Amino acid sequence: GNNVVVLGTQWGDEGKGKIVDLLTERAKYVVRYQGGHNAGHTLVINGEKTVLHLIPSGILRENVTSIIGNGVVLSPAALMKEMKELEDRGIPVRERLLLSEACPLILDYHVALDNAREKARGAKAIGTTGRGIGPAYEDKVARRGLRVGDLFDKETFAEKLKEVMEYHNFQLVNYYKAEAVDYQKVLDDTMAVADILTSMVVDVSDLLDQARQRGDFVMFEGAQGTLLDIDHGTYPYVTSSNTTAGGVATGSGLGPRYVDYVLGILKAYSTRVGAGPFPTELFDETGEFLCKQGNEFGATTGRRRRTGWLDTVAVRRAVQLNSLSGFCLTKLDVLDGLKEVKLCVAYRMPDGREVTTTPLAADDWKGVEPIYETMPGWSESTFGVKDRSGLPQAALNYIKRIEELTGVPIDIISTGPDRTETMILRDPFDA
Amino acid sequence: GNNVVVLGTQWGDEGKGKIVDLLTERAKYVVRYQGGHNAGHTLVINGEKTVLHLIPSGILRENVTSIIGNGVVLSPAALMKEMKELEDRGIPVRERLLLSEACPLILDYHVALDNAREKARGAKAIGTTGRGIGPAYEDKVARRGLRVGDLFDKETFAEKLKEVMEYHNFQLVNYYKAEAVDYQKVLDDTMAVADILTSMVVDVSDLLDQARQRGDFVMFEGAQGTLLDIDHGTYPYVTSSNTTAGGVATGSGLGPRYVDYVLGILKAYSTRVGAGPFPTELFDETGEFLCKQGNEFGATTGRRRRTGWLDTVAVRRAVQLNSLSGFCLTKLDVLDGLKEVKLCVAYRMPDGREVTTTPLAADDWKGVEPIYETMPGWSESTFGVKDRSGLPQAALNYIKRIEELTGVPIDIISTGPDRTETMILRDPFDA
Ligand SMILES: Nc1nc2c(ncn2[C@@H]2O[C@H](COP(=O)(O)OP(=O)(O)O)[C@@H](O)[C@H]2O)c(=O)[nH]1
Ligand SMILES: Nc1nc2c(ncn2[C@@H]2O[C@H](COP(=O)(O)OP(=O)(O)O)[C@@H](O)[C@H]2O)c(=O)[nH]1
Ligand SMILES: O=P(O)(O)OC[C@H]1O[C@@H](n2cnc3c(SP(=O)(O)O)[nH+]cnc32)[C@H](O)[C@@H]1O
Ligand SMILES: O=P(O)(O)OC[C@H]1O[C@@H](n2cnc3c(SP(=O)(O)O)[nH+]cnc32)[C@H](O)[C@@H]1O
Ligand SMILES: O=CN(O)CC(=O)O
Ligand SMILES: O=CN(O)CC(=O)O
Ligand SMILES: [Mg+2]
Ligand SMILES: [Mg+2]
């Protein structure tokens, strides 16, 4: 249908970037509805690599208008920084990127805070990405955060900032005994790029309304994944926003009833970056082989990712939360060369109970062990294959099983980082 | 259809309570997906009054299971308090109410904070309801908030609380120089009702999934209204949550694509409680007559409500944000006796521009004046009328106009506080 949503069904890094970019070929708009620059998507066109963080992954297409919705936490600094890098490479960012005046602003102190909280947590740290995503979402919700629209009347912006900065420094200094952030440098750096920002402002919410009434193919691009959902995720080891399909309406302004199809990006195995429950986590050679073979390092912090088997119990939670319509199975090629492959099909609770449902809150996952279901592998190569035909039978089978255990069709299978190393069985846009 | 959403298209107090209760007759479930006990709904059955705050307005029906979704901020105190009052009146609360372990907990210090922030704001206060709604949403988003699930392992709950309470007292004391909240009394009061709470726990998200797969009529009941939306509302004069239709999926766990119909509660005139932009606000006799005649006082704080004309510019923002399917026109009877009636149809911007769109952020509303469209009134009585037929022509006309200016059909018209003083033209459940 017209409005297609692409999100991460696991713990982010499933392959949203590539997939957004591959499917945008047909779309007018691309909307990031949540997160900030903690995200790190990764598009590879004809072997040329672009890793986007805060800018929508539809940015490399002149025929698509990239929008950053009000749900997103906007860092003026990082935006300018990514902007220039894309511009140096001939991608006229400023020309194809629009933004919301409702977007909260991430400023230096937000990072100051994040660093503090995390240190305070001492040994039980969330393992956040370092930006000030959390604190920015808090200030937002606390109704003291600064938003893009505030950048307009600059005299008052300066009153507001001095005020908020005064607040956060007291804590930083007196409480965390950390060094305060200077109000002047914050004000200056922000003001130096204000005009750039305010320039891209548009009423995204009303924009999506007409795009829709016309029939425009729009694509929502999600950051992070389901189990990182501030609400439904492995709290408190989560991100401070709704990464689940409901952040679409709340993070863009589009009426919820206008989501037509929801595509879940599903990685073929599991990876996690940050502290948190991970039932199917591996610490053996196959664990190493997965990270190694799938170049599993964060596209934003550099951190090695925790690898594990594909958890069907957890993904099935994704199906229901996101109202999935289909799955895009990614990184299949990474499994090539494995003798056999396993997918967690049920959870063994700490008290002997066998369940096919997931707990909800880090703690409530404290002793769960997974009940796999071993499948034979395939030594054949699936890399860049563009057709089921080239996929070996084991593969076809491992894939069919996933459909059975979830009741969700795998509409897209990806055989490589390259925009073109993919098979599209059913295009979300024409369904 | 099966899933029906009922929300406030204005600034809350449109009449959600009555309408939820009237339509639940046909439903298995009722889900509150956001807010806390700042809400104050008001059902009147056969002249008997019940004002609900945190408990779903489907509570007075034995055949409906009331659920409080993870989006809601749960005050153990207030819950118990409302519970007992309903129980004293023969409504077996505990028997028909289920809840989420993901619901954040509002504890004494959250109120301590709210009071502080507001005082800090000195003359530019938001005019919040006094609960600790805001601070609770912040702690949530900050990943330090306590949730219903934490109440299970009580030894650790006590570590967590001591920790969070230590944090908030330092600020209260050292910063706001306010008196700290005792960790012991908080721990005790909470622990005294823990078991009650944990008793109603259910996996709401998975619950809604099966309710849906079966075909159960579910109703989402919203608190506050659209222009109070943390994101899309008149920031910062808003509530700390998404009152717009996207909070349904994010606040229940139901897949966004499963919203079938969205019903907007629209009050016939406008009222606002709290500080904030109010284009069509009245300060004359008609303003008085509206408050007086419509008993316009908050069902939660007691505060007189600011009354004004029905703003079509603002409501049209509601239509698009919520993907409305219909409107329930409430309190028509309150206008009886007026010579003529006006509805704002366009906004006159401070710079001479005429627009039919709304600004987004308190400030960006700083000088807008409304462009009405006077309609003749009707001295006839519409009170408790249960049929268009009894509605005078002026009325029919004032109503038809609303449809024209919005392109949204008025499916329900309400002529009184009583469950039965209403006309249902098209029942959301069978559409
Ligand atoms: N081998 C392989 N690598 C892939 C595939 N899809 C994506 N990648 C790469 O795998 C990584 C996905 O990382 P990431 O960008 O963080 O995922 P995202 O955050 O969802 O966009 C990046 O290196 C991608 O270029 C695939 O199907 N096969
Ligand atoms: N006259 C009149 N009063 C109504 C009507 N509908 C609701 N009320 C009353 O108007 C008020 C609505 O207030 P409130 O409960 O705060 O609305 P809510 O928060 O949306 O549930 C309460 O007094 C209701 O009993 C109506 O159609 N006519
Ligand atoms: O507060 P933030 O910065 O969001 O970090 C909280 C936790 O969420 C994790 N985290 C945040 N964003 C991501 C992403 S974004 P994407 O590239 O999948 O869109 N991925 C993985 N971990 C993340 C971070 O790794 C840490 O575990
Ligand atoms: O932080 P909170 O407690 O939500 O208060 C913030 C502002 O929102 C306003 N406020 C909060 N909830 C409501 C409701 S709930 P309902 O009965 O319509 O569901 N109504 C009106 N004002 C509200 C409060 O009046 C103040 O203006
Ligand atoms: O792709 C982005 N992630 O891996 C975030 C991180 O590396 O922290
Ligand atoms: O119906 C509830 N509101 O009026 C909230 C309040 O009175 O503060
Ligand atoms: Mg990534
Ligand atoms: Mg009310």
CATH number of the domain within which A147 lies: 1.10.300.10
Distance of CA A43 to the CA centre of its chain: 14
- Residue A6: name the closest of A227, A327, A222 by CA: A222
Same domain as A44, residue A10: yes
Q: Structure tokens of B84?
A: 């007992």
Residue A371's beta-bridge partner residues?
A346
Report the run of H or E that residue B270 belongs to, with start and end. Answer: strand B270-272
Looking up tokens 């997974």 gives: A370
Cα–Cα distance measured from residue A227 to residue A230, given in angstroms and rounded to the nearest whole number: 8
Cα–Cα distance measured from residue A243 to residue B235, given in angstroms and rounded to the nearest whole number: 23
Contacts of A243 in chain B (CB under 8 A): none
Looking up tokens 């075909």 gives: B215
Cα–Cα distance measured from residue A250 to residue A376, given in angstroms and rounded to the nearest whole number: 43
Ligand 7 geometric centre to CA of A305 (Å): 11
Burial of residue B273 (CB within 10 Å: 0-12, 13-18, 19+) is buried
CB-based burial, A35-65: b 16+ in 10 Å, e otherwise: bbbbbbbbbbeeeeebbbbbbbbbbbbeebb
Peptide bond into A428 cis (omega under 30): no
CB atoms within 10 A of CB B131: 25
Cα–Cα distance measured from residue A142 to residue A124, given in angstroms and rounded to the nearest whole number: 25
Cα–Cα distance measured from residue B71 to residue B253, given in angstroms and rounded to the nearest whole number: 9
Q: Structure tokens of B259?
A: 């919203």
The answer to whether the beta carbons of residues A30 and A56 sit under 8 Å apart is yes
Cα–Cα distance measured from residue A263 to residue A430, given in angstroms and rounded to the nearest whole number: 13
Same domain as B402, residue B275: yes
Domain that holds residue B241: 1-100+201-265
Contacts of B364 in chain A (CB under 8 A): 101, 149, 152
Strand ranges, E, within A20-69: 29-32, 43-45, 48-50, 65-68
Report the run of H or E that residue B424 belongs to, with start and end. Answer: strand B422-424
CB atoms within 10 A of CB B312: 24
Strand ranges, E, within A386-425: 410-414, 422-424
B13 lines ligand 4 (CB under 6 A): yes
Residue A170's beta-bridge partner residues?
none
For residue B388, which phi and psi values (nearest 5 degrees)? -45, -50
The answer to whether the beta carbons of residues B234 and A102 sit under 8 Å apart is no
Cα–Cα distance measured from residue B57 to residue B52, given in angstroms and rounded to the nearest whole number: 6
DSSP string, A114-133: HHHHHHHTGGG-----SSSH
Same domain as A1, residue A86: yes
The answer to whether the beta carbons of residues A372 and A409 sit under 8 Å apart is no
Method of determination is X-ray
Looking up tokens 């932009």 gives: B277
Nearest to B361 among A149, A206, A357 (CB): A149
Q: What was the resolution (in A) of this experimentally determined structure?
A: 2.5
A423 three-state secondary structure: strand
CB atoms within 10 A of CB B413: 26
Alpha-carbon distances, residue A383 vs A8, A294, A335, A402, B129 (angstroms): 22, 12, 10, 20, 59
What is the Cα Rg of chain A in Å?
A: 21
Which residues 6+ apart lie within 8 Å of A70 measured at CB? A100, A102, A103, A204, A205, A251, A252, A253, B231, B232
Same domain as A429, residue A294: yes
Q: What is the CATH number of the domain that holds B27?
A: 3.40.440.10
Residue B32's beta-bridge partner residues?
B68, B221
Alpha-carbon distances, residue B358 vs A144, A211, A406, B319 (angstroms): 22, 18, 43, 12
Cα–Cα distance measured from residue B181 to residue B108, given in angstroms and rounded to the nearest whole number: 7
- What is the identity of the amino acid at A342? K
Parallel/antiparallel/unpaired status of strands B340-341 and B375-376: antiparallel
Q: Is A65 left (phi over 0), alpha (psi -120 to 50) or beta?
A: beta
Same domain as A384, residue A317: yes
Residue A7's beta-bridge partner residues?
A264
Parallel/antiparallel/unpaired status of strands A3-8 and B354-355: unpaired
Total domains in the fold of chain A: 3
The answer to whether the beta carbons of residues A372 and A309 sit under 8 Å apart is yes
Same domain as A429, residue A363: yes
Cα–Cα distance measured from residue A275 to residue A318, given in angstroms and rounded to the nearest whole number: 20
Which residues 6+ apart lie within 8 Å of B285 measured at CB? none
Cα–Cα distance measured from residue A220 to residue A256, given in angstroms and rounded to the nearest whole number: 12
Q: Structure tokens of B369?
A: 């004046």
Length of chain B: 431
The last residue of one of the domains, among B265, B297, B321, is B265
Same domain as B185, residue B53: no
- Residue B204: name the closest of B311, B67, B78 by CA: B67
Alpha-carbon distances, residue A222 vs A57, A60, A190, A322, B143 (angstroms): 10, 17, 26, 12, 21
Report the run of H or E that residue A77 belongs to, with start and end. Answer: helix A76-88
The answer to whether the beta carbons of residues A140 and A242 sit under 8 Å apart is no
Residue A327's beta-bridge partner residues?
A264, A410
Residue B263's beta-bridge partner residues?
B6, B326
Q: Structure tokens of A175?
A: 């409480």
Residue A218's beta-bridge partner residues?
A3, A29
Same domain as B389, residue B256: no
The last residue of one of the domains, among B200, B218, B239, is B200
Cα–Cα distance measured from residue B16 to residue B12, given in angstroms and rounded to the nearest whole number: 8
Smallest CA–CA distance, residue A269 to chain B, in Å, is 24
Q: Structure tokens of A149?
A: 């629209």
For helices B312-322 and A204-214, angle between their N-to-C axes, nearest 10 degrees = 70
Same domain as B70, residue B135: no
- Residue A347: name the closest of A362, A367, A361 by CA: A367
Looking up tokens 């948190």 gives: A276
A71 three-state secondary structure: coil
Is A70 annotated as belonging to a binding site?
Answer: no
Same domain as B330, residue B244: no
Ligand 1 geometric centre to CA of A13 (Å): 7
Peptide bond into A236 cis (omega under 30): yes
Q: In three state form, how does the secondary structure of A187-233 look?
A: HHHHHHHHHHHHHHECCHHHHHHHHHHHCCCEEEEEEEEHHHCCCCC
Q: Which DSSP state fits B216?
A: -
The answer to whether the beta carbons of residues A63 and A166 sit under 8 Å apart is no
The answer to whether the beta carbons of residues B228 and B238 sit under 8 Å apart is yes
DSSP string, B300-338: TT-PBPEEE-EEHHHHHHHHHHHT--EEEE--GGGGTT-
Distance of CA B234 to the CA centre of its chain: 16
Report the run of H or E that residue B224 belongs to, with start and end. Answer: strand B218-225
Q: Structure tokens of A228?
A: 């990182």
- Residue B350: name the closest of B246, B244, B277 by CA: B277
The answer to whether the beta carbons of residues A164 and A144 sit under 8 Å apart is yes
Mutate one of A121, A321, A364, A366 to test the B interface: name it (highest B CB count within 10 A): A321
Cα–Cα distance measured from residue A60 to residue A68, given in angstroms and rounded to the nearest whole number: 15
Length of chain A: 431
Which residues 6+ apart lie within 8 Å of B303 measured at CB? B127, B273, B297
Task: Tally the C-alpha atoms within 13 A of residue A1's C-alpha that lie toward its C-beta.
Answer: 15
The answer to whether the beta carbons of residues B103 and B73 sit under 8 Å apart is yes
B228 lines ligand 4 (CB under 6 A): yes
Is B301 annotated as belonging to a binding site?
Answer: yes
The last residue of one of the domains, among B211, B235, B265, is B265
Q: What is the CATH number of the domain that holds A275?
A: 3.90.170.10
Q: Structure tokens of A230?
A: 């501030």
Alpha-carbon distances, residue A335 vs A47, A280, A287, A338 (angstroms): 21, 16, 11, 6
Contacts of A205 in chain B (CB under 8 A): 232, 317, 320-321, 360
Burial of residue A28 (CB within 10 Å: 0-12, 13-18, 19+) is middle
Report the run of H or E that residue B282 belongs to, with start and end. Answer: none
Same domain as A275, residue A358: yes
Residues in contact with ligand 5 by the CB-under-6-Å rule are: A 12-13, 38-40, 129, 273, 298-301, 303
Ligand 1 atom with minimal separation from the A8 CA: 20
Same domain as A363, residue A283: yes
